[PDB]
Design a protein around this ligand. Structure first.
Ligand code: RIT
Length: 330
């Protein structure tokens, strides 16, 4: 089997991407944020505290003839930005782009933090990291991909995120028409539960490539590219007037600037992030100070290849016995 679904930016900055997911019988379609940096499939639901729901579409398990309470199971997750959610669990039929998993754990939120409430476009998360990070207790649950894998034509999924445009998530096959050149594969460590890999270096603009190992995670659920402070300083030093603002919480630059590209290495191959991808717009409405899309990871404790990086590539998440990651230009 295979599945193929379009993923759509939630706003004009590509802050996140949402993908329609069918849950239950008859189907309830929710728009989920596919996240290769976490491993819980959780949704806004009929159980979510009413004051914490503001415009999202909800899952109502009582309206699904295939929903079954997963008795005694609870979940609770805390994310890198301080956001969180928690609740109870149902198993139900879940389909993505024509690929169906029966018996998928659907984590129903009873509570969500303010950042989720305030985003009416995201109806929940679909985690695509390793199932060892799933938070359901006392019986840990598998991700949608892990449950589907043995049925897929190939044990893979791909992320092809668009710049100011929709993209695609494919399950079980590699669309050889979706990229240029060849795919370069690189080793993954699963020891922390993430798609954790090592970039071989970077370049800023037309500058020389610096060979240096940069460990980090391929993370579709984070908007920006978070790298060591050394790398980030070398980038922004090429932009007149850019500076790190403690008040704003990172690097800002004059909205009048034209930004240089940023290249990262994948083995001997190179992925080029165009300058325009690094512009996240005014820090507040009407400001002439713009927010940078490359920021320091210091204090996060991990480097994060978020959407700014991934959307410059066709990315293969290879869930073979020894997982690997592939990157191609497109
Ligand atoms: C316009 C508005 C709606 C939006 N702003 C954003 C930008 N934001 C907030 C982020 O990128 N926030 C990032 C974040 O926490 N992302 C998260 C939550 C999230 C989900 C959906 C939408 C938005 C956020 C999702 C990410 O995959 C992070 C990556 C990570 C991993 C380890 C350590 C630190 C970080 N995953 C986790 O935090 O997983 C932690 C886990 C805990 N237990 C099991 S896994 C930070 C790391 C920067 C997106 S949409």
């Amino acid at each position: 089997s295979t599945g193929s679904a379009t993923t759509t930016p939630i706003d004009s900055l590509d802050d996140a991407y949402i993908t329609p997911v069918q849950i239950g019988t008859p189907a309830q379609t929710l728009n989920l944020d596919f996240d290769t940096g976490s491993s819980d499939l959780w949704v806004f639901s009929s159980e979510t505290t009413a004051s914490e729901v503001d415009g999202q579409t909800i899952y109502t398990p009582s309206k699904s003839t295939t929903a079954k309470l997963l008795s005694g199971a609870t979940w609770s997750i805390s994310y890198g930005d301080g956001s969180s959610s928690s609740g109870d669990v149902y198993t139900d039929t879940v389909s993505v782009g024509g690929l169906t998993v029966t018996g998928q754990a659907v984590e129903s939120a009873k509570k969500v933090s303010s950042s989720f409430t305030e985003d009416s476009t995201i109806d929940g998360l679909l985690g695509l990291a390793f199932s060892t990070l799933n938070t359901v207790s006392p019986t840990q649950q598998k991700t949608f991909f892990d449950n589907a894998k043995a049925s897929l034509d190939s044990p893979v999924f791909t992320a092809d995120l668009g710049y100011h445009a929709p993209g695609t998530y494919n399950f079980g096959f590699i669309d050889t028409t979706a990229y240029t050149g060849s795919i370069t594969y690189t080793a993954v460590s699963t020891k922390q539960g993430f798609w954790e890999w090592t970039s071989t270096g970077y370049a800023v603009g037309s500058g020389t490539f610096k060979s240096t190992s940069i460990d980090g995670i391929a993370d579709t659920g984070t908007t920006l590219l978070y790298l060591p402070a050394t790398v980030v300083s070398a980038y922004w030093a090429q932009v007149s007037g850019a500076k790190s603002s403690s008040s704003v919480g990172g690097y800002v630059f004059p909205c009048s600037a034209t930004l240089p590209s940023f290249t990262f290495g994948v083995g001997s191959a190179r992925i080029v992030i165009p300058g325009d991808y690094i512009d996240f717009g005014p820090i507040s409405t009407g400001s002439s100070s713009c927010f940078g899309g490359i920021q320091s990871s210091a204090g996060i404790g991990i480097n994060i290849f978020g959407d700014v990086a991934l959307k410059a590539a066709f990315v293969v998440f290879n869930g073979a016995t020894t997982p690997t990651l592939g990157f191609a230009s497109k």
